[PDB]
Amino acid sequence: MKIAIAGAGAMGSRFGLMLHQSGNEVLLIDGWAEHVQQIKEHGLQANFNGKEVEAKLPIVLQSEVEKEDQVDLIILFTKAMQLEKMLQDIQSLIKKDTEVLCLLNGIGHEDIIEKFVPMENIYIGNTMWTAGLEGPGQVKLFGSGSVELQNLGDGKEAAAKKLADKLSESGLNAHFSDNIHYSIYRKACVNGTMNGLCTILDVNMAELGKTSTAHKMVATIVNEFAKVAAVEKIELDVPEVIAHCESCFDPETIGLHYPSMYQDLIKNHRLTEIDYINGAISRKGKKYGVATPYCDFLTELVHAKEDSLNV
């Protein structure tokens, strides 16, 4: 395969390195100029379990994707809010049969991706590998992991299984799963409850859990996610998903943490990903005729809070 790695951070660098080592033709694409320049001049340097390895991986600044060959596969490691811009910047690499594998754990990315490749050529996945970015052009590659992925498109299960096999040839331990839609929805329920509620109430997850109405608010939101998912033939186990959301309240695990959205807005004074979480459910709700008032309101509140902080 000719593969483009759209987002050459720690995980993209792992995938790019592993795929390159097995004889694939890889292009790294990244927005961090010092990262790009270091890798151009000296290759990607990695501590791999833990041997010092180098690889001269092709790399381009995402804004300078002019002359490169078109690719068979794009693997996406770009945050939701940067995804459409990345795709716009790299669209010259897309040929008719180019497949896209998303490893972004979020809902509705397909709708952006669909503008650039047909649904039949889009695959969604989760990665359980770890990776660390030590400095520009410098990665440390931890230990063990796996990839699970699924076709979007209808009738593309066989194609998804070949894609998995191909990634597995590079040691990525990839597998087909028909459970990826489900797991993305389940994770989004956590992201659609803890993030917005903590951000608006100014509490960590444990303190949210100590409130008298947290269970009601979480349950109501999860039911909205589930109504929308049911339209897409995904039947969430609502009680389990609610319990999974509420497991974040445990101060012994992650409860004392303030969630990523709180870090973005309250700490970093940056715009939140709310439109890609509760907003995505609101958008589907409008399309499907499904009421999502808590997702609507929470989204509206978080935007108001952003505005109030001049973010």
Q: Which is nearer to a second copy, 102 or 206 (CB)?
A: 206
User: Rg of the chain over CA atoms, in angstroms?
Assistant: 20
- State in angstroms the smallest separation of the CB of 243 from a second copy: 19
301 is an interface residue for a second copy by CB under 8 A? yes
Q: Does 210 bind a second copy (CB under 8 A)?
A: yes
Contact window for a second copy (CB under 8 A) among 36-44, 117-125, 177-185, 213-221: 213-221
Number of residues written out for the chain: 311
Angle at which helices 238-246 and 180-191 cross, to 10°: 50
In this chain, which of 48, 116, 182, 297 binds a second copy, going by CB under 8 A?
A: 297
223 near a second copy, rule: CB under 8 A: no
Q: Is-contact 40 111, C-beta < 8 A?
A: no
- Helices within 134-277 (DSSP H only): 157-168, 180-191, 194-201, 205-209, 214-231, 238-246, 260-262
Pick out residues in 162-201 that bind a second copy (CB under 8 A).
197, 200-201
Q: Which of 187, 210, 233, 284 is catalytic?
A: 187
Alpha carbon distances (Å) from 117 to 25, 104, 126, 152, 295: 21, 17, 20, 12, 29
Binding-site member from 220, 223, 247, 263 for a second copy (CB under 8 A): 220
Omega before 50 within 30 of 0, i.e. cis:
yes
- In the list 133, 207, 223, 234, the residue contacting a second copy (rule: CB under 8 A) is 207
Q: Tell me how far, at minimum, the Cβ of 208 lies from a second copy, in Å.
A: 7
- Is 187 considered catalytic here? yes
275 is in an annotated binding site: no
Span from 48-56, 151-159, 232-240, 293-301 in contact with a second copy (CB under 8 A): 293-301
Q: Are strands 44-48 and 51-55 parallel, antiparallel or unpaired?
A: antiparallel
Smallest gap from residue 38 Cβ to a second copy (A): 40
Residue 283 annotated as part of some ligand binding site: no
Note whether 291 binds a second copy by CB under 8 A.
yes
Q: Are 182 and 234 a contacting pair, CB within 8 Å?
A: yes
Residue 26, SS3?
strand
Asked if 80 touches a second copy (CB under 8 A), the answer is: no
Q: Is 287 annotated as a binding residue?
A: no
Number of shown-chain residues binding a second copy (CB under 8 A)? 28
**195 neighbors 254 (Cβ within 8 angstroms):** no
Q: Closest CB to a second copy among 48 and 297?
A: 297
Output the six-digit token pair for 151.
Answer: 């076709």
Q: Is 184 exposed, middle or buried (0-12, 13-18, 19+ CB in 10 A)?
A: buried
CB 38 within 8 A of CB 137: yes
1 is a contact residue toward a second copy (CB under 8 A): no
Q: Summarize the annotated binding site for NAD(+) as residue ranges.
A: 10-11, 30, 79, 82, 105, 131, 270, 273
Contacts to a second copy by CB under 8 A? 197, 200-203, 207-208, 210-214, 216-217, 220, 291, 293-294, 296-298, 300-301, 303-305, 307-308
Active-site positions read: 187
